[PDB]
Amino acid sequence: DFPILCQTCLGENPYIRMTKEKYGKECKICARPFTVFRWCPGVRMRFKKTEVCQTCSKLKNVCQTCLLDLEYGLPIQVRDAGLSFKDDMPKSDVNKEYYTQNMEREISNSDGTRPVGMLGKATSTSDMLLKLARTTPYYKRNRPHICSFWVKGECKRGEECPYRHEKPTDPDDPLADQNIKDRYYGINDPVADKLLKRASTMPRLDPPEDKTITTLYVGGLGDTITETDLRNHFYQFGEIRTITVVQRQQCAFIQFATRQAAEVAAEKSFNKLIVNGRRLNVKWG
């Protein structure tokens, strides 16, 4: 009873009518019958319905319809590229059936609210994916499918047509093909790969222009801030060597015992840290 859901599926209305079938469909993964839920998300929306059984969601920690993580809204291949691939799960036939069975007993014996072993891992995060995690609901995802009479030029329902009248996606784009099983296991997922390419460009971690340099060239200081903000932020890292301050261009230089600590302060800092409700931007030299 009650599905497991994204906030993005469930709807942008707080009031929702949602129907239930006892054994509605096989799950497209572990292939068992399971309680299925439909509901209307919104005014122009599509009537989504749960695609996979609740168990294999608890297993990989995901929405039932979307298969996007609960916290990050990221396809599974991504958050695995983000932490731990070694979760695994047999893809192969009768194994899948077997492992699902056992893991279904293991889950039965848990407190109920926890994605099994992954959650022991799931706490430690934020490497990148937080910064590539999506922020707001994305409703373009629930729109009705593309009317396929109209996309041949004919559709004779006129304005009534609940489907959507517009140009489809060119089958050329590798982002088209998108199997379900595939998106689930984290194989060759085009979306996930795209997000990976997007991850790399994040100006961030390579640093190291020069050896031993712990000099921090800090842009976007501002004249509200004091140094004491700086120190009481940065004593976490280690033994400071010193701090140079310039308020004429509002840039603050810093120096630490080891370069390692400076890299760190970059990492922890870059395009993340803000104090005095004002962004504190960092660069090398």
């Binding site: 192969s92 009768v94 492992y99």
Partner: peptide, 29 residues
């Protein structure tokens, strides 16, 4: 057919006990 040569038939990842198995990996043939 692929329950053998593709994907490890049924998998029991060994249970983990008071020691570190993280590091260990093994060589090819």
């Amino acid at each position: 057919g692929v329950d053998y040569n593709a994907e490890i038939p049924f998998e029991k990842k060994p249970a983990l006990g008071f020691y570190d198995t993280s590091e260990e990996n093994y060589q090819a043939l």
